[PDB]
Structures are given as structure tokens and as C-alpha cells.
Amino acid sequence: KSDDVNGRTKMYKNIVDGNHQMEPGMPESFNVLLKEIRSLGINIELEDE
């Protein structure tokens, strides 16, 4: 409903298709926080699977 720039459009199409679901993905606010931390000298990774 707010921050997922992909998920929002992917959602809207499902609402008209008649499918109530969400393919959420990751919020862009937090996705930016990764770059701001990484823009400093900090290596921040998402591990595993």
C-alpha cells in the first residue's frame, strides 16, 4: 500500500483481475537504507536463502 514500487502495481493489476493477493517484495524505504549504510564503509548483506 505504500512503499513497494513493484508490488503496488503488481497489486493493482490483481485487484482488477479479481485476485486479492499481494506479491509483496521489499519496501523501497528500507531498500534505500541498505545503500545509505553501504554508501558509508559498511558491507551489509542478506545471507542464506
Partner 1 sequence: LKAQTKTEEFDAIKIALASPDMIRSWSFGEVKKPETINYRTFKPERDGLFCARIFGPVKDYECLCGKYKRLKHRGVICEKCGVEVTQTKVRRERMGHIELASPTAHIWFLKSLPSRIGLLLDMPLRDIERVLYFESYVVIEGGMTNLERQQILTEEQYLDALEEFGDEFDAKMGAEAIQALLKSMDLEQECEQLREELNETNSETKRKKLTKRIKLLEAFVQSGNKPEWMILTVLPVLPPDLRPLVPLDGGRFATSDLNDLYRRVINRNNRLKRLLDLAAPDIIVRNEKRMLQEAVDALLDNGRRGRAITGSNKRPLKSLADMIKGKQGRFRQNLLGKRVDYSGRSVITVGPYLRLHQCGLPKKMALELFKPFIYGKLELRGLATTIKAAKKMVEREEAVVWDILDEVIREHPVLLNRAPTLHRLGIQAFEPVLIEGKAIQLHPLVCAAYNADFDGDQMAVHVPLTLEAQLEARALMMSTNNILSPANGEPIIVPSQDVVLGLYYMTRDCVNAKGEGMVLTGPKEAERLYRSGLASLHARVKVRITEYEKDANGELVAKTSLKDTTVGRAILWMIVPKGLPYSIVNQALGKKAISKMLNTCYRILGLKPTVIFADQIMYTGFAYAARSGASVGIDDMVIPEKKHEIISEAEAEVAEIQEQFQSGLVTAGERYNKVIDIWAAANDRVSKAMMDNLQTETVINRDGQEEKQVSFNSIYMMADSGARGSAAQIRQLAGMRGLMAKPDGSIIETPITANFREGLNVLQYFISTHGARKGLADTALKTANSGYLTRRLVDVAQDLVVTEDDCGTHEGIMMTPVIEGGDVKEPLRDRVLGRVTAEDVLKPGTADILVPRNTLLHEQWCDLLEENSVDAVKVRSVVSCDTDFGVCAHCYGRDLARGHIINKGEAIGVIAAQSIGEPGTQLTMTGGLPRVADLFEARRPKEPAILAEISGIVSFGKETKGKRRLVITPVDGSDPYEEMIPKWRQLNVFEGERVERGDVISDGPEAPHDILRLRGVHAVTRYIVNEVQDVYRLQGVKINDKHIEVIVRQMLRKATIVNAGSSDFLEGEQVEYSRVKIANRELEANGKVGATYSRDLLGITKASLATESFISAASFQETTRVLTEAAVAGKRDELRGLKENVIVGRLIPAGTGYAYHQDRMRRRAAG
Partner 2 sequence: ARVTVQDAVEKIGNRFDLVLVAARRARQMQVGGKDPLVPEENDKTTVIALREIEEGLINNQILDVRERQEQQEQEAAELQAVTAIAEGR
Enumerate binding residues for partner 1 (CB under 8 A).
Answer: 1-4, 8, 11-12, 15-18, 20-22, 24, 26-27, 29-30, 32-33, 35-49
Q: What is the CA angle 13-21-14, rounded to 5? A: 15
Q: Which does 39 bind (CB under 5 to 8 A by kind): partner 2, partner 1, none?
A: partner 1
23 touching partner 2, by CB under 8 A: no
34: burial class by Cβ within 10 Å (0-12, 13-18, 19+)?
A: middle
The rounded distance, in Å, linking the Cα atoms of 10 and 17 is: 11
- The nearest distance, CB 9 to partner 1, in angstroms, is 11
Binding site for partner 2 (CB under 8 A): 18-21
